[PDB]
Design a protein around this nucleic acid. Sequence first.
RNA 1: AGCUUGUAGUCCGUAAGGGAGACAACCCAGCCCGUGGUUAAGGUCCCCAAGUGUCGACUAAGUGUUAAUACUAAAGGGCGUCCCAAGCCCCAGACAGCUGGAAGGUUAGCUUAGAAGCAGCUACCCUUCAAAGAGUGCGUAACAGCUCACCAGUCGAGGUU
RNA 2: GCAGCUUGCUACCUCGAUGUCGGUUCUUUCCAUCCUGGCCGUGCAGCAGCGGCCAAGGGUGAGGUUGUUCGCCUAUUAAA
RNA 3: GCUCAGGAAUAAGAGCUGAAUGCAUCUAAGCUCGAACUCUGACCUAAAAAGAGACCUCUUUAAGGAUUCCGGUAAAAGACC
Lengths: 159, 176, 138, 132, 44, 337
Amino acid sequence: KPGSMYRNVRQRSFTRRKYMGGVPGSQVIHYDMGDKANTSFPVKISLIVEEKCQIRHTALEAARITANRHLVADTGKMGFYMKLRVYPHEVIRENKSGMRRAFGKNVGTAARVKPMQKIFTVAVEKQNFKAAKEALWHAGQKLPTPCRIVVDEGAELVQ
Amino acid sequence: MVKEIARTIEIPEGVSVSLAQDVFTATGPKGTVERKLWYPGIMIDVKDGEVVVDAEYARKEQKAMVGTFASHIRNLVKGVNEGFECKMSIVYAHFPMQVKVDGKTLIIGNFLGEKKPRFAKIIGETKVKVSGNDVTITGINKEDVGQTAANIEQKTKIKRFDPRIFQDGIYIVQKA
Amino acid sequence: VIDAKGLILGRLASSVAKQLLSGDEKVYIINAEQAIISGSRAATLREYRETRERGATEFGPYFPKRPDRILKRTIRGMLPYKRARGRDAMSRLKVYVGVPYELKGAETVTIPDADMRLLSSSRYVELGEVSQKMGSKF
Amino acid sequence: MKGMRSNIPRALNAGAQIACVDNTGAKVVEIISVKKYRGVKNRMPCAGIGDMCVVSVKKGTPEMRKQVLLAVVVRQKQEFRRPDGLHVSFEDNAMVITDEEGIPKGTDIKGPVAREVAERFPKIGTTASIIV
Amino acid sequence: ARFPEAEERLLNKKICMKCNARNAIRATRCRKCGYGTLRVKSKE
Amino acid sequence: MASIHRPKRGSLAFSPRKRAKSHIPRFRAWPEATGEPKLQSFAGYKVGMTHVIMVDDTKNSLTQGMEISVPVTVIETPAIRVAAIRAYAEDSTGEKAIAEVWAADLDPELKRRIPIPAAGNQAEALENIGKLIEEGRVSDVRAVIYTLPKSLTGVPKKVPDIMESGISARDLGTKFEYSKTILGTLVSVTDVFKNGTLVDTAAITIGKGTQGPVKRWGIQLMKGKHSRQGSLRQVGTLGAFNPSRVSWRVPQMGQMGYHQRTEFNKRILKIGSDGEEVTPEGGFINYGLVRGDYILIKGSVPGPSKRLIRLRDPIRAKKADLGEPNILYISRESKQG
RNA sequence: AGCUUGUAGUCCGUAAGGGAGACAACCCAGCCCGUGGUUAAGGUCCCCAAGUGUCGACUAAGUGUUAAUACUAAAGGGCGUCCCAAGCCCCAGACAGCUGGAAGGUUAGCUUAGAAGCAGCUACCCUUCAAAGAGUGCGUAACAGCUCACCAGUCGAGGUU
RNA sequence: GCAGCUUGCUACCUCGAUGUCGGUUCUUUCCAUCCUGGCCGUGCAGCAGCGGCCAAGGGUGAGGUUGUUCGCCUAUUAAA
RNA sequence: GCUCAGGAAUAAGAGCUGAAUGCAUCUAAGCUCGAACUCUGACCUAAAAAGAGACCUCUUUAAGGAUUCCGGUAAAAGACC
Ligand SMILES: [K+]
Ligand SMILES: [Mg+2]
Ligand SMILES: [Mg+2]
Ligand SMILES: [Mg+2]
Ligand SMILES: [Mg+2]
Ligand SMILES: [Zn+2]
């Protein structure tokens, strides 16, 4: 089931789970990676999507896995802090007959993100800026939107 | 500092470079050579034993073209003055190649045991000499000498076998 | 008598078509093999072999091969040649490979705005090269 | 294969039940296909003298019967011409069991073999009593 | 055996990992497709 | 759909399959000169077929050295007359005839084809052609020849057949000199072709009139139950639904035979002068007997008996010098047996 | 979905004429008849009335020459080319080439008789030195000439992210 | 993402009828290439493979079951 | 019975020279090779090619054509010889 199905935003939100029934649980396990009790990381880069889209929980999990693997391999187990900012709140549904009673059944969850919205933020030391940049580039390849990396803190510390 | 696109070519004594029409002609002790060098936006001037190639504009294409034209002019004057020599080596494992010149072609017989000899073409007034187990290629044109050496090396290509075992052929050891 | 040497094919064709539709002269075009088509050689050859090999045999387009016939066809597409005015215009046009013996020594003219030295690059081919790569003997 | 000097019509097509004329225990074999024969649409595989065919032993011993074997046709009733213009025809069609190389499985061949198979397969020639 | 002058021309080039094209020993990018990763041609 | 494939029925290399526009074959190409000047073509009349026993001299053949029976076509080849010299000018639009000089004396039966050119300008016409050659206006010279079938008896016609023949020479001046030598003479087939060599034969093939697609293109018949449902010798379909038309490549009825055909690499096995050497007992059926000099061509030739066969030196021959054949026996037995 | 079902405006339906190649409903325009004039939309190389128009750039792909459009291909990539900006190095001589040394460390420990710097897990390895590491290569059953990361001189201008 | 060659979805055309499936016959096209031609890589010694690129000129068959399409099986075949 | 090629220009690709980018670089210009593809070459057809052709011969109350006649190398009628 391709991500192009539940990708475009054409509809209102579908998030009130007390008026629906049976939502499959999200695949994304953690939302904070690296060293969670460190705040004195001078450089902080984030990945912002540049289109209004819906990101499925499986896409978020895939991007998170790839970025976390790259960061752990390059900077080490606690050489970085990584935050997945958005939670999949939207419930995705599918119509599984034809068009009669076509209101779908819940098949997953997605995060409805806006243009220029931060998806992932990574904090590292000065020497790991390019590694964090590379990891976030790999993470954005798993997402259904074009992305761009921005430096939030420590711009003068990289160039 | 100041970027200059124009390039200067010195004309050694005995070399009479002319640029009538859009064709460049160089005459020297080793012979005479003539090449076509035309490209819009590039200008070539011959003056006082010195050719200068300049472009009207300064974009990357004009920079590349002035560089290429200056290199061609320098090679032409060198060819009319000092010429070019290209060295190739004859290597074989089991079958001794029979290599000889029959005019404007090089006969490569018994290559890998074949009953039909190979034929490599000579370009221009290029001088190919089989110096025993090696081949020397000389001429006034760097284009012609390079192409003649390339023809010799490409004609001796083992086109199906593993290159790490079958290595018979004639290979350039020094370019023009 | 227009000398087609070093002239853009479409611009020469447009000029000659308008002149023929101004309805006062017979136009002769010589050296049609020496007309120029701007653009890379691969693209022009690809498009001309696509046009040459297109139609149906009982029906389809019969795109010519001779450079003079190709040039006449190029002018033909800028005329209302199915109309009496266009038919009259096409009857007053003669295109030649080289110079015909009768027109030898006649005073020729050239269209200044169709000149190929107004092009900014060297990406061009002559019409004769296209014709001979399509298999035309001339 | 090596060419014969004569022109042989491919007289037998697939399904033909030919008498086997060697001492291998096969009495009647049926042609299944013809080796080195590519056909065309709707054309049955065709075999004349000198051709090797895949056959099925229809009659003979129980050991031989129902076996897919190779056989070479050595006689054919359809007339074929020798190089000097003479046309030759036999009274019947005959084959002998062989391998891929053309070596007979049997040891004696009852009846005459065509000279063409005798040259194309020398062992069939030596095994045969008379070559016509 | 193996002649070094032949190995210079036969085995001393890089290979594009996406199109397999031969490239110069010093090339960092494939000329045919522009791929950024090139491996030396395997001489063993 | 999973489809069974079949090569297309017949050749589209001879389309449209219409009647030949003349009873004479016209040569569209002429080979290159490889020796002394001579005519590149000859014309005879097909008599019939016989066979010879010859020693196989073909190199590398399996039957080389032994006696083989070879079918041959006998072609009567009386001397042709060189009627005219024609000069051609090459330009962008191809060759054009620029000059012609006719021989002063021409055969009286030539009037059956054309009004006879007079014995007028031959020296001045020849000098005009010489001037045209000197000034560069002439690209090549051809010889206009005609046959004289009156000497034959199996061919009923007395009206000559006129055709242009090339001259093979190394240079245009040599061609003009040779043509002036041969102008108005009678050339024998030995002056054009030598025994044992390959030639190309052109003729109009046997006419069969209007024929169906089964015979004309070799389409399949309807098979099995379809053989007796009313369309036995008819093509299965004329087309698809789209395109909405019958393609010209669909096999259809029409004229069969009486086309121009050229055969390649037909070997001359004997140049003869005595027609009794080849005429069988009882004569050739529907023809009679050979009277003048003849030629034996190995194998078959296009056309029926009495058709004009044009012989030209080969344009795509492969084998080198073949030799003189050793004909041990020419069969003169009755073709009527 | 040129799907289905709402809503506001406006159309076609029932809307000519002008223009978009043709176009129910897209643009101008709502239209009594005739004549003259000037415009609208749209266009001005020819087909085709009017620009082979002007200025300043870009594109090399015949890309394109497609208002809306049911009639128009994405993610991803490009030392293709043209721009803007910010770091770092730079005539106290960069960037890439041409030359010149990689001499004291160690043959650092590794079951099996053998990978003694490229299986391998670890360093304030030299006093100090313009200059030599627990190692970047076709190569070694246990050693080696032949290539680097480095300061040196070289012509001499920008280089790099 | 492409295609529209599977099956769906849909109800725009056709109910004063556009004759169904499969096969057969004949013609044609596409290329996303099975063989044949040319190439590149290889964990390519040769033989032979595996992977990929160009290329649609020619070829791509015969049989047993089954109405089959599809598929299975047989023996040939350069490939079927 | 006959049924080849050869040449040209290319695809992928392999190279030469070559700058942008001092070096290097098959490429950005330029150049050499490179397929059963394409073109040419063979072969069939083709003055109804509207630019509706060239040349020669014969003759302008003729040249010559058709019809009738005897036929067949042709032929559904015509046509063709
Ligand atoms: K088909
Ligand atoms: Mg509206
Ligand atoms: Mg209504
Ligand atoms: Mg209304
Ligand atoms: Mg309207
Ligand atoms: Zn590549």
